[PDB]
Amino acid sequence: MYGLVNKAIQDMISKHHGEDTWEAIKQKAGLEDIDFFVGMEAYSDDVTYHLVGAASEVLGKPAEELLIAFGEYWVTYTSEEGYGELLASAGDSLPEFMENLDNLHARVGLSFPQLRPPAFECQHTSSKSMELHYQSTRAGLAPMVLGLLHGLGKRFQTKVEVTQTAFRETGEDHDIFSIKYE
């Protein structure tokens, strides 16, 4: 993924655990060569998976948990590191924001020419609930989506309840979530 994603993981782990711990993790991932991540340069997805895998070990938390946390963190990181207006432009409630996501990622993708963004479809089952379809070229990021949704729930002062009802990992076409909010 683009280096932005990996900087943010770095920033999260430094801010929360210090730079020694970050360096430990970076060393463990086999990425000590890399002095800094370049925000708008494409890296191999491996770099991200290795970082999370390395951080699970060092921190003694499962990988899924780090992904959930990173997902929440991202919502705050983007508002603060150069994407705040883009974020604000994408809506001011959870269901509007998720309807606008594919277009948010497309705008980001004018500027990040090799972007492989995910795709999100909403099927609203009422004014306070939806079925959310997450389609990705990648595997293993559902728990990050879960964290992102909670971050968005914070951003909009909205309580969100999320449960995954279909699983791309098991050979189903894609991850599906049922969501209830406020």
Binding site for a copy of itself (CB under 8 A): 60-62, 64-65, 68-69, 125-126, 129, 131, 142-143, 146-147, 150, 153, 159, 161-167, 169-170, 178, 180
* Dist. CA 75–CA 87, nearest whole Å: 9
For residues 24 and 58, is the Cβ–Cβ distance under 8 A?
yes
Amino acid present at 69: A
Site for ligand HEM in 106-165 (CB under 6 A): 108, 112, 115-118, 136-138, 141, 144-145, 148-149, 152
C-beta of residue 53 within 8 angstroms of C-beta of residue 140: no
Partner in contact with 163, chosen from ligand HEM, a copy of itself, none, beta carbon below 5 to 8 Å by kind: a copy of itself
**Cα separation of 110 and 97, whole Å?**
19
Q: Please check if 83 is assigned to a binding site.
A: no
- Smallest distance, a copy of itself to C-beta of residue 63, A: 9
CB 134 within 8 A of CB 142: yes
List CB contacts of 141: < 8 A, sequence separation 6 or more.
Answer: 67, 118
Residue closer to ligand HEM by CB (options 56, 71) is: 71
Alpha-helical (H) ranges within the chain are 3-17, 19-28, 45-59, 63-80, 84-89, 94-99, 101-111, 142-155
37 touching ligand HEM, by CB under 6 A: no
Report the C-alpha gap between 4 and 102 in whole angstroms.
Answer: 18
Q: Which of residues 85-104 bind ligand HEM (CB under 6 A)?
A: 86-87, 101, 104
CB of 51 to a copy of itself, least distance (A): 18
- 43 in a known ligand binding site: no
* Shortest distance (Å) from residue 133 CB to ligand HEM: 12
Binding-site annotation, residues for heme b: 2, 74, 105, 116, 134, 136, 138
Which residues of this protein are in contact with ligand HEM, per CB under 6 A? 1-2, 4-5, 75, 78, 83, 86-87, 101, 104-105, 108, 112, 115-118, 136-138, 141, 144-145, 148-149, 152
